[PDB]
């Protein structure tokens, strides 16, 4: 394919651990290791807002555009919510007794999941004053990554350093199933293929491998070996037929999501790659990744 990669916006900062696109404003949310979070207008190149939230790392950061919120999870155990128009803090609660690795936001329901080093995923309901509605117990190490099935968010997958993916149903305490990934350095990330033509999940590991999973057959479709150190993330782009992976090798790679052949290796020049966001509507097929030395927003051709 012709990918026509364009550097939309680049910003140097502290290490970016979390990153997310606003769905209707030309904004990106970055969540930094210094305890700072930033909202950047990547079209105008103007900073919209920045907030010193704590002194510890803030690893997880999403928009909740329907409530004009940002939600952020930090190593100080806390989930914090801010109205991005005013800066007003909405809530600030101890979510786990250990580090918060990942936050996912339910698309239609007032539900947030947090993944943590306390070995659990916790479900929060903001229409019940952020009440803990369920604790998903069973994982054996740090829950690195939580992701709702975007085709059915009554279900979510949890990526863990116990080297399993677990797929759960909201309201059920036992997992639907457990993927034994054979990624012995653990699972850093898990994502779903969002289109209906394949029942696919993807994982990334410290073992330098990416693995494609069929949740119908519970088998490994493919192994993608194209990084020379820790693979931080691997995600299916929501429109283009590509996978984007990012590594502590400082590189972003674009794979053919059909043939699993490398389309492009991006040496972005900000050292270790930590996180990825894709624009939810696929506006300019926008992608962005967080790095040791800042973030970059990229637009992809049709």
């Amino acid at each position: 394919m012709k990918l026509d990669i364009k550097k939309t916006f680049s910003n140097r900062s502290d290490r970016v651990k979390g990153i997310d696109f606003h769905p209707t404003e030309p904004w990106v949310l970055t969540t930094l290791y210094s305890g700072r979070v930033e909202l950047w207008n990547y079209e105008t190149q103007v900073e919209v807002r920045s907030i010193q939230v704590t002194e510890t790392p803030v690893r997880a950061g999403k928009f909740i555009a329907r409530k004009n919120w940002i939600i952020v999870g930090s190593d100080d155990f806390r989930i914090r919510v801010f109205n991005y128009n005013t800066g007003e803090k909405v809530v600030d609660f101890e979510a786990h007794p250990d580090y918060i690795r990942s936050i996912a936001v339910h698309p239609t329901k007032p539900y947030v999941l947090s993944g943590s080093d306390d070995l659990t995923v916790k479900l929060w309901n903001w229409e019940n004053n952020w009440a803990l509605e369920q604790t998903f117990e069973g994982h054996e190490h740090f829950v690195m990554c939580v992701a709702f099935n975007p085709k059915d968010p009554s279900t979510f997958a949890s990526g863990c350093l116990d080297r399993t993916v677990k797929v759960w149903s909201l309201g059920q305490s036992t997992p639907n199933f457990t993927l034994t990934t054979g990624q012995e350095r653990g699972v850093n990330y898990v994502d779903y293929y969002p289109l209906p033509d394949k029942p696919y999940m993807i994982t990334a590991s410290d073992d330098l491998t990416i693995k494609i999973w069929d949740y119908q057959t519970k088998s490994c479709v493919a192994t993608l070996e194209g990084h020379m150190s820790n693979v931080s993330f691997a995600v299916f782009h929501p429109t283009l037929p590509i996978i984007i992976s990012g590594s502590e090798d400082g590189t972003l790679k674009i794979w053919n999501s059909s043939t699993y052949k490398v389309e492009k290796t991006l040496n972005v020049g900000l050292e270790r790659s930590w996180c990825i966001a894709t624009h939810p509507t696929g506006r300019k097929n926008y992608i962005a990744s967080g790095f040791d030395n800042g973030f970059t927003v990229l637009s992809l051709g049709n």
Binding site: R15, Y33, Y99, F142, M144, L161, R272
Partner: peptide
């Protein structure tokens, strides 16, 4: 030492 500190 915290595992996955960075």
């Amino acid at each position: 030492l915290k595992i996955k500190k960075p």
